[PDB]
Design a protein. Structure first.
Lengths: 121, 733
């Protein structure tokens, strides 16, 4: 009910004083009601099995879509993690974002949703 | 135009928060500010100070003082504040927010040393708080609390609270002394972290607090840690004129009242652990209770933000210099191990600690490594539930720190029985680290002599593969299916091959699962979509509970060298209804899994299976709760679905237990006929696990009292078992 209500880590805007890549809530609407996080900067040899273990400590996962190369068709350096409810999603965003995976700092962000063709660099 | 409502809420908080000036000035300054703003509308500054009174305990004394200075400037304010407080407290109890309610009581109490409430006025109600222990046919939990709410305030309000009613606070003492000794302690064993009375006894909360009040009484109610902002305000505070708390009669127990479950104090530190540096309060001293109560409260507030939480913790008010690092850590593990469940989510602690290490590189590290060692060393008497959490924590912790550990310090386990805790630990630990990386990486980080306890490799077991054992039935069916899958065969094209199989069909299943898991063994992605594509085949083969069991049997026979896989499959298998909860139950309690029955993953699954069942019920409860709030033959459909959603949920626990008693009484009568020791490493796990079920899913279970009590756990049942049920009952009694 005060300033302890704050959730800097789950805050949904990363207020980039930049021009246009998120201005209308026709999208934004989906962001704050999403359960799928965009995980970027993974190790080229990071496996699906590994991500599963890590992101499950913050709640049950639905599906992990490994990032591929539109050309070479292999680990491009990212992936998408869809949880079953926002609850678990916020946690991973609260406690997993910024931690290490395969000996490196992984940065996670909120994603409107996974569409086919989004797994190609 | 509420710019004034925003600035206020800010100025209110800004005082408790650190500053570049004395806390006194900030309070004094804030005084005229708020006073100057009373005519210029009160209502806000009222509903504001009340909030800080509940949601900001760690800052207690500071805000009681603020309210003081206001009293000694506006009598009529304190009178409408205290009028608010009780009313708030009157709403808290009805909603059953007893954890919160104790914060008020602790506030009001302090107000007494702030010249706001009459010294006696508070004992008046405190008498009523103790007087509930005289009420008939009411859960001990209710009694324990009101006594808690009292005793706990006393480290604050008691110093000056004994200059009076010491005639009654000798009565209320003896009245609380009698009830304290006349209280059943059935719970303690099911709530202890360790069972070892050495080196640190795990004492009941109320049985420990009483020992902290006594040390206070005999010290003339003199403490040395709670900061009194009103020490330099006595001069302005005296002429202030106190108020009277009208008669308070504690809301009567109703079949709609929920009271905090009993708790057992976590103790793993004393002043000797840290020799050089400040002296840690004693286990029975009040200071300790104070710091711990406040630290638990610091994370209670800023848990959502690990980064800030660190600072708020490292920069604690600590009147007399204490060894914060050990207190911080001790409070974290205290929460992480809090039986039944921790106050927050396990992963949170892992990350927080990491943050702490970043904030204070020079101190926190060394401690943690010292705490790990200790936790390990005491492992033997540790309760399994906590162990898992321990195993879960460290591995994760290691994964963020290049898996760097001086293992040779635990070289003592290599010379112990594999079924023994210490070695079992390192095992389950490494096993988990692998999943956080890959089996090879682990072999390079451990010493040569530890290679033995290293993880098995994730090798798939294809019964009908390069096996020259052609003497096995349906050998060709699998080979034909093999090529079938590779050529992009469909369900009907798979049924065809399967129709030509000899014998629900034990063999027809075996040759299916085995074959599909082998070509989909590469990744988790394949195995799933595979289960999905030929889903119709699966659902056709396993249409019986015997078949649903078998699937899992073969599957295990295939992936018994890859748990994470076994886990992920069972999960997705039930979510797509290829297998149900009941089956996974009889499977977890099957003879094929006896050699692994004590390994983590096992129960992990069992719980996954349960949660998914638990979530299912709740969902259909909300879909029906939303439906009614409005063609509607949907409600009929849902209502009927809830019935079935629970029925299966009941059966589940009914099974997990019936089977649990089966494998227990089986061991109890065995060590009785042979005369062998009951305390076997396997008995430890098995029995405590049965306890873990009662502990994590207590909320739900209470719903089958009519069944558990009179049917599944009756007299005839061996006392070692029944014990845990009667223990479980101690939580809500």
């Amino acid at each position: 009910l005060k300033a302890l209500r704050s959730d800097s880590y789950v805050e949904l805007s990363q207020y980039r004083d930049q021009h246009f890549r998120g201005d209308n809530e026709e999208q934004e609407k989906l962001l704050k009601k999403s359960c799928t996080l965009y995980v970027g900067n993974l190790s080229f040899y990071t496996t699906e099995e590994q991500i599963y273990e890590l992101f499950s400590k913050s709640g049950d996962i639905k599906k992990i879509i490994m990032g591929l190369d539109k050309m070479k068709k292999t680990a491009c350096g990212f992936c998408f993690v869809e949880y079953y409810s926002r609850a678990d999603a916020e946690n991973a965003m609260r406690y997993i974002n910024g931690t290490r995976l395969d000996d490196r700092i992984i940065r996670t962000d909120w994603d409107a949703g996974f569409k086919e063709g989004r797994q190609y660099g | 135009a509420n710019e004034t409502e925003d600035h206020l809420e800010s100025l209110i908080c800004k005082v408790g928060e650190k500053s570049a000036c004395s806390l006194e000035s900030n309070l004094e300054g804030l005084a005229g500010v708020l006073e100057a703003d009373l005519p210029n509308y009160k209502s806000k500054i009222l509903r504001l100070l009340c909030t800080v009174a509940r949601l900001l305990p760690e800052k207690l004394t500071i805000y009681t003082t603020l309210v003081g200075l206001l009293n000694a400037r506006n009598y009529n304010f304190g009178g409408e504040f205290v009028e608010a407080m009780i009313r708030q407290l009157k709403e808290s109890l009805k909603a059953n927010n007893y954890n919160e309610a104790v914060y008020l009581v602790r506030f009001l109490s302090d107000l007494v040393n702030c010249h706001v409430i009459a010294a006696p006025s508070m004992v008046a109600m405190f008498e009523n708080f103790v007087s509930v222990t005289q009420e008939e046919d009411v859960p001990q939990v209710r009694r324990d609390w009101y006594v808690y709410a009292f005793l706990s305030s006393l480290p604050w309000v008691g110093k000056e609270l004994y200059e009076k009613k010491d005639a009654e606070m000798d009565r209320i003492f003896a009245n609380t002394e009698s009830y304290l000794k006349r209280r059943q302690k059935t719970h303690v064993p099911m709530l202890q972290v360790w069972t070892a009375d050495k080196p640190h006894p795990q004492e009941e909360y109320l049985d420990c607090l009483w020992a902290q009040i006594q040390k206070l009484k005999k010290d003339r109610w003199q403490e040395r840690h709670i900061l009194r902002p009103y020490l330099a305000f006595d001069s302005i505070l005296c002429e202030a004129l106190q108020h009277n708390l009208p008669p308070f009669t504690p809301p009567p127990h109703t079949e709609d009242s929920v009271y905090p479950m009993p708790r057992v104090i976590f103790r793993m530190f004393d002043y000797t652990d840290d020799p050089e540096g400040p002296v840690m309060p004693g286990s029975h001293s009040v200071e300790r209770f104070v710091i711990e109560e406040n630290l638990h409260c610091i994370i209670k507030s800023h848990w959502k933000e690990r980064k800030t939480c660190a600072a708020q913790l490292v920069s604690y008010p600590g009147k007399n210099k204490i060894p914060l690092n050990y207190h911080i850590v001790e409070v974290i593990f205290a929460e992480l191990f809090q039986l039944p469940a921790p106050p927050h989510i396990d992963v949170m602690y892992t990350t927080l600690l990491i943050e702490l290490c970043k904030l204070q590189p020079g101190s926190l590290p060394q401690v943690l490594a010292q705490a790990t060692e200790m936790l390990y060393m005491r492992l033997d008497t540790m309760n399994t539930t906590c162990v898992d959490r321990f195993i879960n924590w460290f591995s994760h912790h290691l994964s963020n720190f290049q898996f760097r550990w001086s293992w040779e310090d635990w070289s003592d386990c290599l010379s112990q029985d594999p079924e023994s805790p210490k070695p079992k630990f390192v095992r389950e630990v490494l096993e988990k680290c692998m999943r956080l990386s890959y089996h090879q990486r682990i072999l390079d980080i451990v010493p040569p002599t530890f290679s033995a306890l290293c993880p098995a490799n994730p090798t798939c077991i294809y019964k009908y593969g390069d096996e020259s054992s052609n003497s096995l039935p349906g050998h060709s069916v699998a080979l034909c299916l093999a090529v079938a899958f590779k050529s992009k065969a469909t369900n009907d094209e798979i049924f065809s091959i399967l129709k030509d199989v000899p014998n629900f069909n034990p063999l027809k299943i075996e040759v299916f699962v085995q074959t599909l898991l082998h070509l989909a063994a590469k990744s988790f992605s394949h195995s799933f979509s595979a289960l999905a594509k030929f889903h119709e085949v699966f659902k056709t083969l396993a249409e019986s509970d015997e078949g649903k069991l078998h699937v899992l049997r073969v599957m295990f026979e295939v992936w018994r060298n890859h748990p994470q896989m076994i886990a992920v499959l069972v999960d997705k298998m039930i979510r797509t209804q290829i297998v149900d909860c009941a089956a996974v139950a009889n499977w977890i309690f099957s003879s094929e899994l006896s050699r692994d029955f004590t390994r983590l993953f096992v129960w992990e699954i069992l719980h996954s299976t349960i949660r998914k069942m638990n979530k299912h019920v709740l969902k259909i409860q909300k879909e029906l709760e939303e439906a009614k709030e409005k063609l509607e033959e949907q409600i009929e459909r849902l209502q009927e679905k809830v019935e079935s959603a629970q029925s299966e949920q009941k059966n589940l626990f009914l099974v997990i237990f019936q089977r649990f008693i089966m494998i227990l009484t089986e061991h109890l009568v065995r060590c009785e006929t042979d005369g062998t020791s009951v305390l076997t490493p396997w008995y430890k796990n098995c029995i405590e696990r049965l306890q873990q079920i009662f502990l994590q899913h207590h909320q739900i279970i209470q719903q089958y009292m009519v069944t558990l009590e009179n049917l599944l756990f009756t007299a005839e049942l061996d006392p070692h078992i029944l014990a845990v049920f009667q223990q479980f009952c101690a939580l809500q009694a």
